[PDB]
TrEMBL record, chain A:
This is ATP-dependent sacrificial sulfur transferase LarE. It holds the Pfam family NAD_synthase. It comes from Lactiplantibacillus plantarum. One of its GO terms (molecular function) is sulfurtransferase activity. InterPro entries: LarE, NAD/GMP_synthase, Ni-pincer_cofactor_biosynth, Rossmann-like_a/b/a_fold. It comes from the Bacteria.
TrEMBL record, chain C:
InterPro entries: LarE, NAD/GMP_synthase, Ni-pincer_cofactor_biosynth, Rossmann-like_a/b/a_fold. The keyword Transferase applies. This is ATP-dependent sacrificial sulfur transferase LarE. It comes from Lactiplantibacillus plantarum. It comes from the Bacteria. Pfam families: NAD_synthase. GO terms for biological process: purine nucleotide metabolic process. Residues 17-83 form the NAD/GMP synthase domain.
UniProtKB/TrEMBL annotation, chain F:
It holds the Pfam family NAD_synthase. GO terms for biological process: purine nucleotide metabolic process. The lineage of its organism: Bacteria, Bacillati, Bacillota, Bacilli, Lactobacillales. Residues 17-83 form the NAD/GMP synthase domain. CDD domains: LarE-like. InterPro entries: LarE, NAD/GMP_synthase, Ni-pincer_cofactor_biosynth, Rossmann-like_a/b/a_fold. It comes from the Bacteria. This is ATP-dependent sacrificial sulfur transferase LarE.
Length: 248, 269, 238, 258, 251, 261
C-alpha cells in the first residue's frame, strides 16, 4: 500500500530467484527491473537480453543494448526470425501474440543455459508471457505507472527510452504478407521522415502506395518537404507517396 | 496554304455528302464542324449526336446537349453501355479503343437509319475511325489548332467546352474492374472536391484507398478542408482518403534534375 | 555562487525550520522545494497542500496531487471558494489580490494545525528565491536528485479569459475551460479562449497560427456545441 | 427551351415596352438587361439608373456608372436615404422590405418623369435578395424582371453575355451593409463608415469577397475558407489597421464566409 | 463627341490609307486597331507584325502571334536585336526610347516592302511617343480622341473579348540601372521566371543581384509558394545563381 | 567500445594532467569536459575561461559564464580583440584559424600563469580529451545525461564572421546590424537563425521545418531589418544548413552547387 512495501516485495522476489535473465527493452519499466536486479543480486547474477529482429529497427536495438551497458549490466543480444512463423509472416491479427511467444521461448533457452531461475520482463499493473512462465515482478508488487516513476527517481534513474517502440507489422494490412524488402522499405521511409523533424510518423504499406500518417498540427509545416518525400519514398520502392488526410 | 482553302476544302466535302451525322463533343473542334455542316447543308440534313454513358458525368452530357441546340442543330442523345465490353469493364490499356469502337458503331447505326452519307468527327485492330468509315473533314482539310480558332471566331462561335473531358476509367489502375458503384463513388468524390473550389482534381481509385491529385499550388489552401474531405469520401465508401504528394500530373512542375528522376521512376511500372 | 553553494544555503534554511507546509503547484520550482523539504526534514514533518478551485483545472489539481506523492510526500487537498469573494466573482482588476489573500490564509490555517513553522512556495517564504536560484539552477538541482516528472505547463487563473466587470459563473468558467482543453488536445499547449458572450476569441502564439488551419472547422463546431455562437481567432495572437 | 428562344422572348418584351428605365447595379445580370435594352430600343429610349446610398459602397457606385456609360447608355445617378426609414435605421429582419420599397419607389418616379413604360431589374430565376441575402429574391409587381420571365438561369446569363461580347462587370455580388450588423443594432454613419473602410482595406489586399461583421468593439472577419490560407501574411497589418478604424479586437471567423 | 463619331473618324482614316501594317502587341489597344483595319480594309490589305526579341518572353510572342491570327489577320513575326544598340545594352533610363526607335524602323521597312501606306500602333489619348513621331507611325486611336473608355466601349461593340490583359515589361527592369545587359544574364533571368510562372505564379520577377536572385511574388501568393521552395532553389542555382531568395516585401 | 570504457580513459587522462584550464563555450562538448574536469581534479585545479569578443553576442557570453560557475567552476573572463588581426578583419577563408590562434594563445598564457598542465577544449598546443577518448557525438550526449547535465547551449553558437562573405571587411556597424537582426528574429520564436550580410541585401536562413510558420512575420521582419539598414530583406529558399535534409539525389546536387563557390 506504500512504495516501500511495493519495493520490499520486489526485493524479496529477486533475492528468492538468485539468478535472473531480464528481457530489456530500454523503457522505464525494464530499466527499473534491471537496476533492482543488479542492486540485489549483483552483476554476475543478471543477464540482460535485447531482441534484434526484422520487426524492429537497428536503432532501437543499438539504443537498448547501450542503455543496458550504461546501467552496468552484462548484456547479450539475440536474433529472432519472426518471419519464420506464418502468423507473423502473413500478418494475422494474432501476429503480436506469436511474436511474443517466439521471443519468450528464446529467453527461456538463454535462461536455462546461464542458470537463471526465471525470465523477468517490464510489465506492470495497468498472455504469451504467462504461457512461458516469465515473471512480471513489477506487476506482482502492485507497481503502477506512478510507482515506477517514484522508484526510478529514488534510485537516481534518469535515462530510458521515452518513445515506446511498436512492431513494423502495424504498417501492413492484416492480409498483407511481410517480406524482408517491404519491411526494409517501410523502415527506411519512416527513418527519412523522422530525419526531417517528424518524430511521430507512420508509413503505412499498401503495395505500391505509401500512406503517411502525421500529427495534423505538423502537416502545414510538412508541405515544404512534399516533393523531397515523394521522390525519396519512390526511390525506396513505392509507386505512389500519399498523405493521409485523417492524420496519425 | 490559306484559311480560305481550309474552309473551301471543308465546304466542298460537306456539299459532297449532302446528309451527315456529326459526333458532337461540345469541344471547339466538333463545334466548328457542326456549324459548318449546318451552314452548308441546313438543319434538315444534319443530325448531331452526343454520347451519354457511365464513363462521363451527367453535367457534360447535359452541357453538350444544350450547346448543340444552341448551334441550331437537330440533336440526338444516345446512351452507350461501355461496361458491357470486357476490355472496358476490366480496364485494359486498350480500353479507349474499344470505347471509341462501340461509340462509332452506334453512330454508324444512327446515320444509316436517318439517311446520312457519313459520320463526322472533329479529329489492336483497324483505326476505330477508319474501320467504321468516320470522316474527319477538319483533318482532311489540314486544319491546325489555331485555324479552328480562326474560323470559329470568323463564324461568331462563342459557347463551347474548353474543359477537355477524360473518361472516368483513367481514375482506375489497369486491371481494376469498373463497377457501377465504384464509378459513382469516384464521380461523387470529384464533384465534392470541385464544390469546395478545386476545379482541377482527380480522385484515383485504389480499392479501399482514395488518392487525391491536386495542383501543387493549391495544396496549401486545401488543408482547411482535410477533415471534411476525409469524412466525406469515407461516407462515399473509401476507407482511407489520401493526398498524392506528387500532385496532379506529377513531374510537370519539378526542376530539370528531379523531373527526369520522377520520369524514370514511373518508367518501371 | 555555485549550485553546490546555493544548495547548502537552501538545505540549511530548511533545517532551521524543522516542520513545514509547502504550497505545491506541481511545477519544477515547487517540486524542488518539496523534495528538499522531504530530504532534509523527513516525510513526517512536511505537508504538501494543493489548492483546488473553480479558477483552475481539475487536471492540474489531479496532476499536482499525484506528483507530490511521487516524491514521497504526505499530500493534502484544499478547496478554495474564490467565487465567494465579490471582488473575484465580479472580476475586478484587483481580483488577484483578494484571491491571494484567501489562498495564503488557508495555508497559514493548515500550517497552524500541523505544527509547521512556515509556509513555503516555489517562487524563483521563497527559499529558492532567497538562495538566488535562477531557472538554470532549478533544472540542474532537480536533475541532481533524479527528478524528471513535473508539470511543465504553467497554469493561469481563468479570470483572465473574462473582461473586467464580467460576473464569473460556474457555467461560463466550465465553457471556457472545456474549450481550452479541447484546443490543447489538438496540439496547442499555449492557448486562451477569451469569452465575449456569443463570441469566443481564441488567442494562439502567432508562430502556431499557421499550423491551426487544419482544425478551423472542427474547432468552430466544437465550441459552438459548448455554447458559443461565433468562434473566432484573434489576429493579434497571444 | 433554347437560349435563342429565351432571348427572343426578351427582345419581344423590350420591343413591346418601347421605352424603359433600367435599375443598373453593375453585376452580370444587370449588364445583360441594360445591354439588351440598348440593343433593342436604342440609347434614346433607355435610362440607366444607378443607386447611391449609405448601404452600398461608393466604389461599386462609381464602377456601375462608368460601366453603364461604357455600354452606350444614358445613365442617371440617384441617391437614396435608406437610413431615413426607421425600419432600416434599427436593422430589423423586415428591413429589406422597406429598403426595396424605397428603392423601387424612387425608380418609378424616374420612370414616370421620363417616358418609360416600366422599371426593369436584373433578377433571374433563383437569385438572391440584395438587402437580405438568403431570402430568395422575388416578385416586385411594380417592376419587370424580363430575365426571370424568360427563364434565364445563371448559366444562360453567362452564355448570352459572352455572345454579345460583354466582358466588364462586377464579379462579386454586393449585399447591403446592413448584413454586417446584428438584428436590433442601430445603424450609424460612423459604424457604417467603420465597416466599409475595413472591407475596403481587406479588398485592397486581394480579397474581393469579405465581410467585416460588426460586434461593437469586436470585428469578426468572414473570408471564403479557400482564401484563409493566403491571409496569414496579412494578420498584423489587418489587426492594426482595423484597430485604428475603431475596433478593439480584430478576429477571423473560423467558419468562413457564407 | 460621340463614340459613333470617333469610330467614323477611325473608319475614314483607314479607308484613306487603303493598305496598312499594324504593330500588334496583343493588348486592348492593338487588338482594337487590328480588328478595325481588318473590318474596314479586309484581310488582304492588313499585315500584323509582332516583335520578337531578347527583352521579352517567347510566351508573350506566341500568344500575340495567335491573337492576330484569331482576329483573322495575316500576322508576321520579326526579330529585333536590341542589344546590338549600346544605349539599350547599358540599361540607361532612355534605353526604352532606343528600343522603340529600332522597333519602328523595322516596321517602316516591312511597310515599305509590302506596300502599306503607314505603320499603325495602339496608342491612345490622355512617354515613348517621340520615337513614334520620328518614324512617322500613326496612332489612329489617339487621332480620333479615343480614351480608355472609348477603346473598351468599342471593343465590346465589336464583340472583342480576348486580348492580352497582363502588360508585359522589358527584362531590363530586373537589372539595376548600373548593370549592363548581357545575353547570359538575360537568359538566366528569363529561364528562372519561366520556371516560376510554370508553377502557377503568372506575376513574378526574378531581380538580378549578381550571384543572388531576389524573387518578387504577390504577398497573397507567398503562402502557396512553400511547397516549391526546394525545387525553385536548385533550379535557379542550376541556372547560375548562388543564392535564391524570396523578398519578404513582395511584388 | 563502451561508454564506461571511454569515460575511464577520460578519467585517467585528467588524473595525469592534475591541473587544467578549460576553454568553455557553453555547448554540450565543453560543458562535458568542464564537469568531468571538476569531478576528477576538484575546483582548485580547473579554471574555466570564457571568451568575450565582438564576434559573439553578449547573450552567448553571459550564458557560458552563468553555466560554468553554476557547475562549480572558477570562471575567468578574457577579452579578445579578433578585429585587430587583418585575417579576421577582412574575413578571409582562413579567418577562423587566426581567431583560434589568438584565442588559444591567450588560453596558454592563462594556463602558464595559473599552473595548468594543458589547455582543454571540447573537440571530438591544445588537448581535446574527448577526441583522445574516442567520444563521438552520441557518446557526448549519453555521458552528459549520465552526470545529470541538463543546461547547455542547444543552439550551436557560431562566430558572426560566418554572416559575411569572404573578402568583406567587418565593422562595428555591420556586425551590430547583423546581431540586431538575428536577435529580433530570435524574439519572434526562431532560436536558430542566420541573417547573412550582402550589403543592401539581408538573406535570412531558417530551419526549413520553421519556414511555414514564418509567413505571419514577413512584413514585420521586412520593415524591422530595413530600419536596421538593409534595403531588401529576403529569405533563402534553401534554409539553414541546406541539403542536410534533402533526398539522396538533391542532397548530392546541392553539394555540387555548394562546391562551385
Amino acid at each position: 500500500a506504500t512504495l516501500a512495501t511495493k519495493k520490499a516485495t520486489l526485493v524479496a522476489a529477486l533475492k528468492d530467484l538468485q539468478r535472473v535473465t531480464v528481457a530489456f527493452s530500454g523503457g522505464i519499466d525494464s530499466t527499473l527491473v534491471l537496476k533492482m536486479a543488479l542492486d540485489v543480486l549483483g552483476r554476475d547474477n543478471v543477464t540482460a537480453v535485447v531482441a534484434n529482429s526484422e520487426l524492429f529497427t537497428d536503432e532501437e536495438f543499438d539504443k537498448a543494448m547501450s542503455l543496458a551497458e550504461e546501467l552496468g549490466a552484462n548484456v547479450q543480444g539475440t536474433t529472432l526470425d519472426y518471419l519464420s512463423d506464418d502468423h507473423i509472416k502473413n500478418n494475422t491479427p494474432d501476429s503480436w501474440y506469436y511474436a511474443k511467444k517466439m521471443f519468450y521461448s528464446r529467453l527461456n533457452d538463454i535462461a536455462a543455459n546461464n542458470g537463471s531461475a526465471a525470465v523477468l520482463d517490464g510489465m506492470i499493473k495497468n498472455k504469451a508471457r504467462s504461457e512461458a512462465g516469465a515473471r512480471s515482478l513489477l506487476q506482482e508488487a502492485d507497481f503502477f505507472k506512478t510507482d515506477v516513476r517514484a522508484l526510478a527517481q529514488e534510485l537516481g534513474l534518469t535515462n530510458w527510452n521515452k518513445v515506446a517502440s511498436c512492431s513494423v507489422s502495424s504498417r501492413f494490412p492484416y492480409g498483407t504478407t511481410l517480406t524482408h524488402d517491404n519491411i526494409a522499405q517501410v523502415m527506411a521511409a519512416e527513418k527519412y521522415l523522422r530525419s526531417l523533424g517528424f518524430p511521430t510518423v507512420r508509413v503505412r504499406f499498401h503495395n505500391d502506395i505509401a500512406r503517411i500518417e502525421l500529427p495534423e498540427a505538423r502537416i502545414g509545416d510538412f508541405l515544404v518537404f512534399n516533393d523531397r518525400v515523394n521522390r525519396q519514398l519512390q526511390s525506396l520502392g513505392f509507386r505512389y507517396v500519399t498523405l493521409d488526410l485523417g492524420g496519425f
